[PDB]
Design a protein around this ligand. Structure first.
Ligand SMILES: Nc1c(O)cccc1C(=O)O
Ligand SMILES: Nc1c(O)cccc1C(=O)O
Ligand SMILES: [Fe+2]
Ligand SMILES: [Fe+2]
Ligand SMILES: [Fe+2]
Ligand SMILES: [Fe+2]
Lengths: 173, 173
């Protein structure tokens, strides 16, 4: 039938035109609305203390500049570098915290709409004892707008940030 | 848990190392195996007379060189140009025939594994009366290997290529 999502267009030029809109905490912009593939560009600098626990995979292609992913691989606080030109496929549920410090950076991130009842988690870990401080689960509907309200609630509440092993109150900063 | 799909790596350099393997009819190479996102690069020159009827969306990013998509939009034999640097999201079921004439071209194509019972179609249309000549449906398991055997069967059989409106026998060439 129709091309619902429009005609091909130049991506470098699209990124240039929307550069001034790539803004924190999360830094992104969705290219097409109501699609099954969720196609965003993420710039910087961003502010993220959360780990994301995505029930599906996440494709990355660091188009401009560099960034890294803080991970928890196999229990250990780990890092994956998104050097300019790198690509990478995250397995479902690997906890990850995108750090994007470079102004003018641009990373293509691709995900899919989540079916009903498949939940996304956002977690924070204690920077002293390294144990789970807080975890919210959300039925995700916008990878752009549903994020910061969630982090504000954590940021605004030392009961959420108080650790349950040590009593260290996470800075959320 | 583990990074099942490995660590980030440089995509331009990966494409360079596998250039000599991007070979017709279809021209592709999957970057990761057993993933839900099916991430391929497609080079050229390719030989495609089929239209693909994908039950899911297809993301394109023409990385090197140019290509086009022959389409059937709203009944009309149409074209979408994949100019170097273009991106594009195909809606599910839009019939499309990727033409990739340029040696050394490279296009990122992203799709997802198809659930059980969601079928892919490959169709051919009559180049005289413009009506459907032949359509096979397949449970797709490899976007790389399941293709040409299907086209050989059409190519090898004038009963499949004989049109049911006119009697024009499609060249399959
Ligand atoms: N992985 C991300 C996500 O799931 C949402 C928003 C941004 C990112 C990112 O990688 O920057
Ligand atoms: N759309 C394609 C597909 O579905 C399989 C293989 C190649 C392509 C292509 O766009 O070249
Ligand atoms: Fe994420
Ligand atoms: Fe702690
Ligand atoms: Fe296709
Ligand atoms: Fe015909």
């Amino acid at each position: 039938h129709m091309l619902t999502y429009g005609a091909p267009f130049n991506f470098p030029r699209w990124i240039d035109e929307h550069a001034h809109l790539l803004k924190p905490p999360v830094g992104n912009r969705q290219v097409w609305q109501d699609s099954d593939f969720i196609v965003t560009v993420v710039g910087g600098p961003n502010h993220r203390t959360d780990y994301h626990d995505d029930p599906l995979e996440e494709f990355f292609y660091q188009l401009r500049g560099n960034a890294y992913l803080n991970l928890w691989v196999d229990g250990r606080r780990e890092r994956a570098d998104l050097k300019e030109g790198d690509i990478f496929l995250l397995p479902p549920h690997v906890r990850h915290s995108p750090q994007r410090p470079e102004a003018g950076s641009a990373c293509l991130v691709i995900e899919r709409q989540r079916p009903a009842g498949m939940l996304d988690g956002f977690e924070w870990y204690c920077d002293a004892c390294g144990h789970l401080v807080h975890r919210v689960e959300v039925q995700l509907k916008s990878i752009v707008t549903d994020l910061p309200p969630l982090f504000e609630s954590f940021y605004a509440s030392e009961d959420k940030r108080r650790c349950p092993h040590c009593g260290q109150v996470h800075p959320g900063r």
